[PDB]
Amino acid sequence: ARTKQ
Amino acid sequence: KPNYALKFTLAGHTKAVSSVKFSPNGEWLASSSADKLIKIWGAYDGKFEKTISGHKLGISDVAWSSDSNLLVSASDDKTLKIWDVSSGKCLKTLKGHSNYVFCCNFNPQSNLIVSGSFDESVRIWDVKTGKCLKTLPAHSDPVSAVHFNRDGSLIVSSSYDGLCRIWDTASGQCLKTLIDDDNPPVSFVKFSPNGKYILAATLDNTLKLWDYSKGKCLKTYTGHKNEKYCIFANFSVTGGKWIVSGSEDNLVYIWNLQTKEIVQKLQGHTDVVISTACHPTENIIASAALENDKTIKLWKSDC
């Protein structure tokens, strides 16, 4: 999800 | 310059918050999180309202229908879900993407949903039936954002492939590809409230305002940190005309739209600020932060 990477 | 001051801190999500959005009628804030939940909060008082549950994996985005009655959310479970906010019911589960769904929005009318995915496509869905109407082979890398213009006739999308594209809603044709002198991942895009411009974030610490019609970059906003995460950006329109964005140094940045100067930095979060939203009638900013923080903050300015 957006909250990683 | 504005004078945003912290008014409320909203605790409840159990993992990183991914997106916050104010309802069009100004009553509510919706939040989504890696914790698989959507939460509703009073926009003015920050008071927790309810939790809406059902996705099987984390949620990257949530968006309101224009009548403030529905939400759509995008999840790593590869679905979108359409929710009746008042009842908390999942009305439809939108199946069709082959990989994580990252971003979503209703058209201003609110009869269509657009979605973007790690599967490199953009899909357009009928809200009433929950059926996919069109699949656009939009990009060659994950799609980070999707947004309809003011009358719904166009979609703008952005991707890690370095491109912003503008699509005809009705035909699905690619009408324009926008890229500046370098090719960093495009991490966010949206049309301006008047529909003339596109605001695009790229992962080289830069926001840009483009004239869609002319295909020209008109303004650059710099000073913040953004190399890693797909951070939202906003047009603040209730008082002074600002650009607002989270940043990877845990601050909210606010720039003067016209002059491009930084006019304020909001300190308080303890991790990256991934999302911000601006209230439709009051000078209120909501901000949300990642895993080490887990809170949402409401800030208010006199102008």
From Swiss-Prot, chain B:
Protein name according to UniProt: WD repeat-containing protein 5
Chain positions with N6-acetyllysine modification: K81
Effect on the protein of changing F232A: Strongly reduced affinity for histone H3. Significant decrease in interaction with KMT2A
Subcellular localization: Nucleus
Phenotype upon changing D76A: Strongly reduced affinity for histone H3. Significant decrease in interaction with KMT2A
Effect of F102A: Strongly reduced affinity for histone H3. Significant decrease in interaction with KMT2A
Molecular function terms from GO: histone binding; histone H3K4 methyltransferase activity; histone H3K4me1 reader activity; histone H3Q5ser reader activity
Chain's role: Contributes to histone modification. May position the N-terminus of histone H3 for efficient trimethylation at 'Lys-4'. As part of the MLL1/MLL complex it is involved in methylation and dimethylation at 'Lys-4' of histone H3. H3 'Lys-4' methylation represents a specific tag for epigenetic transcriptional activation. As part of the NSL complex it may be involved in acetylation of nucleosomal histone H4 on several lysine residues. May regulate osteoblasts differentiation.
UniProt key word Ribosomal protein: no
TM region(s), chain numbering: none
UniProt effect for mutating F232W: Strongly reduced affinity for histone H3
WD repeat spans: 12-51, 54-95, 97-137, 138-177, 181-222, 225-265, 268-302
Effect of T177M: Found in a patient with childhood apraxia of speech; uncertain significance
Outcome when changing A16E: Strongly reduced affinity for histone H3
GO CC aspect terms: ATAC complex; histone acetyltransferase complex; histone methyltransferase complex; mitotic spindle; MLL1 complex; MLL1/2 complex; MLL3/4 complex; NSL complex
Keyword hit for Nuclease: no
Outcome recorded upon mutating L209K: Loss of interaction with RBBP5 and reduced ability to stimulate KMT2A methyltransferase activity in association with RBBP5 and ASH2L
GO biological process, any: transcription initiation-coupled chromatin remodeling
Disulfide bonds: none
